[PDB]
Amino acid sequence: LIVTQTMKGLDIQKVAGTWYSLAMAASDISLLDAQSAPLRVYVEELKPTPEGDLEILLQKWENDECAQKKIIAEKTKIPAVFKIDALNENKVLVLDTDYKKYLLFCMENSQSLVCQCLVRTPEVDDEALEKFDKALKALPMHIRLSFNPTQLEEQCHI
């Protein structure tokens, strides 16, 4: 347990659809430094399921190419927290969202941590980035990236 910002009253069905990973940050440089860093991921679309799970579509650079990936994030008793199935138990938290402009989320292993500021459009939203920086102030981050509108329209933010 590191992250203790979490969204009260989250309606998961309302986060469905298209998102842009405007900014990312991580507790360790090596998590994000290279285009093929294991947790450098670019979100494309969120699809909550009827039973309340969250399917995620994203792009990740893997074997010298921008790959699509589908990940299912399973619900827990807490509406703002989900579990991804990997070797270690990996937990996704929704910290804050207004549904229509921005969504802040972090993923952590259950010590290491990656967070992103998601936005609805290919636009630099200073206000969402402010909320992002405010939430991160509380956290031990050592690398922060942000992307411009041109990169946001490219595969793997090229």
- Select from ligand DAO, a copy of itself, none the partner in contact with residue 107, using the beta carbon and a kind-dependent cut-off of 5 to 8 Å: ligand DAO
> Could you tell me which stretch among 7-15, 92-100, 101-109, 135-143 binds a copy of itself (CB under 8 A)?
135-143
Amino acid sitting at position 60: K
Stretch that binds a copy of itself, among 11-19, 28-36, 44-52, 98-106 (CB under 8 A): 28-36
Q: In terms of CB distance, is 16 or 143 closer to a copy of itself?
A: 143
Query: Whole-angstrom Cα distance, residue 111 to residue 92?
Result: 13
Contact residues: ligand DAO, CB under 6 A: 38-39, 41, 43, 54, 56, 69, 71, 73, 84, 92, 94, 103, 105, 107
Contact 99, 76 (CB under 8 A): no
Q: What are phi and psi of 30, to 5 degrees?
A: -65, -20
User: Which letter, b or e, does each residue of 93-112 get, where b requires 16 or more Cβ atoms within 10 Å of its Cβ?
Assistant: bbbbbeeeebbbbbbbeeeb
Q: Which residues contact a copy of itself (rule: CB under 8 A)?
A: 29, 33-35, 141-148
